[PDB]
Amino acid sequence: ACDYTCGSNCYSSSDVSTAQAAGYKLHEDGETVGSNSYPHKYNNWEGFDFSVSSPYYEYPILSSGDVYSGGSPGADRVVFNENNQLAGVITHTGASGNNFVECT
Template identity: 40%
Template sequence: MVALRNFTVLALSAMALAFPTPTPTNEIPALLKRTVSGIAAASCEQIQFTSSEVATAAAVAASRVAQGKAGQIGRSKYPHKFNNREATGFEFLSGCKAPFFEFPIFKSEVYTGGKPGADRVVIGSIKGADAAFCGIITHTGADRGSFLQCETA
């Protein structure tokens, strides 16, 4: 009889723990609170980035910019300022103002350190939790250390 009572108490306790409870909004990661305007799909050489991939990379970049130096990752400390010093300068999307920040973008994954690859998402117009998508740039096909601008949809 005691064993049955213990079993019942344990079974009901396990069920109560299994029911999900809502997460308070103050516990939602900062990444999800970032608003990045002007998101668009982009094409760099043979690589196509969906608007979802661009949005994710841009939101992570904005979140890390908001953290300051503590948010920078990788040997090159991304995101870092992009000074737009290319010979021709880039024509970023309207509504995007300096300072600009670059952050690696990949197909189907988010940069967490290590080799940054050739492609970067550029954000600007940083205001608190908000930023603007400026464009995508790539080292592919550019002179060493330079970038080419990718096409946005």
């Protein structure tokens, strides 16, 4: 079963946890990754009511299972905060333009 379903992608708790650990780690060293410099800030234009506190940072989660280290970031992201908390999992899939919809 899927703990998180991002359109076509099936992500498990373990998947989310791995990406998230990679992002908070970069964020902690003050280092980026890719041409879009992940992780960066998630502004929250979508206006999601996260059960966690701002500010937010995003980091790509790959359907491939591997951790992002460059190349296409895909459509799915993991959102965590300064305390290393999971805000959620979002995707551009089924979302107009660069908008975001949440993974089910």
